[PDB]
Ligand binder design. Structure first.
Ligand SMILES: O=C(O)[C@@H]1C[C@H]2C[C@@H](CN3CC(F)(F)C[C@H]3C(=O)O)CC[C@H]2CN1
Ligand SMILES: O=C(O)[C@@H]1C[C@H]2C[C@@H](CN3CC(F)(F)C[C@H]3C(=O)O)CC[C@H]2CN1
Lengths: 195, 44, 50
C-alpha cells in the first residue's frame, strides 16, 4: 500500500506508516502529495506534476469533460475505489458532480475493477476512462489509436516521502529542482514513458 | 510545456508558517477552490 | 523586484531579500520556486504549476 488512514482507529498503513514509524528514511515511489499525508510526513517538492484526465479513442468530437457530462450515449467511468474515482465522489464542482451522479448510478456498468479492464473497454466499446494523466500518457504511447481528451481536471504532484522533521527533505527538494532545471527529469520521463 | 516550474508562497528559512501554508494550499487544491480562483481571474 | 542574487557581492534583492532579512513574514505573489531561491528562503509547495 501507498498509505491511507483508517477511518475508525486513525492508524496509517503503507509507505506512509513506514515513514511515521521511522522504519524507512525515504519513500521513493509515485507517492501523491496530499493534504492528509502532508500533515503526518514531510514530502519533497514534486518530481512530477500531473492531474486527472480522460482516455478515449481518437477521431471523435469529444474535447472535454463537459462534452461527456452533458450526454449519455458515450459511457464513462473510472477504476473503482481508486484516487480518480474518489476525486469525483467529492467534487462539488458542477460538471464533476454531474459526472459522479452518472457513474454512481450506472456503477455496475461503468466502474471497472482494474486499469487494464478499463483500457479494454475504451478499445472495444464506446467508452471513456477517467484516470491519472501519467497513466494515460503511458497508455497512449503504447496504443496509437487512443488519446487524452482535454486537459487536466485537477492538479497534483508525486513527491519523495520522508519522516516529519527529516533533514533529507530539503536536500532532496533542492536536488529535484536542479535535476528539473537541467532537463534531466524530463529525459528520465521520456526514457520510461516513450513507446 | 517546455520546462516545468511552480509558483509558491515565500517565507523566511525556518518559518513555522511554511508547512501550514503548504497544507492549506493542498487542501484548497483538492477541494477545487484554486481551480475556481484561477478561472475567476483568467477567463475572458 | 521578485528576487535575484548579485553576481559580484552576493546580496539579494526584491521580495526574497525582504524574507531573508525578516522584514516580511510571507511573500504572496507569483514567486517562482527555483534552486537558487530555495537555498535561501523556505517556499510553500506550489499553488500553481506551469
Ligand atoms: O500515492 C498514491 O496513493 C497514488 C498511488 C498510485 C495510483 C495510480 C493510479 N490509480 C491506480 C488504480 F488503478 F487503482 C486507479 C488509478 C487512478 O486512480 O486513476 C498511479 C500511480 C500512483 C500515484 N499515487
Ligand atoms: O519569480 C519570478 O522571478 C517570476 C516573475 C514574474 C515573471 C512573469 C513572466 N516574465 C515577465 C517578463 F515580461 F519580463 C518576461 C516574462 C517571461 O519570462 O516569460 C510571470 C509572472 C512572474 C513569475 N515569477
Amino acid at each position: 500500500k501507498y498509505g491511507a488512514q483508517d477511518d475508525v482507529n486513525g492508524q496509517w498503513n503503507g509507505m506512509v506508516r513506514e515513514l511515521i514509524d521511522h522504519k524507512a528514511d525515504l519513500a521513493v515511489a509515485p507517492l501523491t502529495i496530499t493534504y492528509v499525508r502532508e500533515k503526518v510526513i514531510d514530502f519533497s517538492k514534486p518530481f512530477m506534476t500531473l492531474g486527472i484526465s480522460i482516455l478515449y479513442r481518437k477521431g471523435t468530437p469529444i474535447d472535454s469533460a463537459d462534452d461527456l457530462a452533458k450526454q449519455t450515449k458515450i459511457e464513462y467511468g473510472a477504476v473503482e475505489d481508486g484516487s480518480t474515482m474518489t476525486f469525483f465522489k467529492k467534487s462539488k464542482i458542477s460538471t464533476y458532480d454531474k459526472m459522479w451522479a452518472f457513474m454512481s448510478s450506472r456503477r455496475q456498468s461503468v466502474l471497472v475493477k482494474s486499469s487494464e479492464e478499463g483500457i479494454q473497454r475504451v478499445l472495444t466499446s464506446d467508452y471513456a476512462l477517467l484516470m491519472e494523466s501519467t497513466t494515460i500518457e503511458f497508455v497512449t504511447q503504447r496504443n496509437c489509436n487512443l488519446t487524452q481528451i482535454g486537459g487536466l481536471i485537477d492538479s497534483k504532484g508525486y513527491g519523495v516521502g520522508t519522516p516529519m522533521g527529516s533533514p533529507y527533505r530539503d536536500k532532496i527538494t533542492i536536488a529535484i529542482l536542479q535535476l528539473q532545471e537541467e532537463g534531466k527529469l524530463h529525459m528520465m520521463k521520456e526514457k520510461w514513458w516513450r513507446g
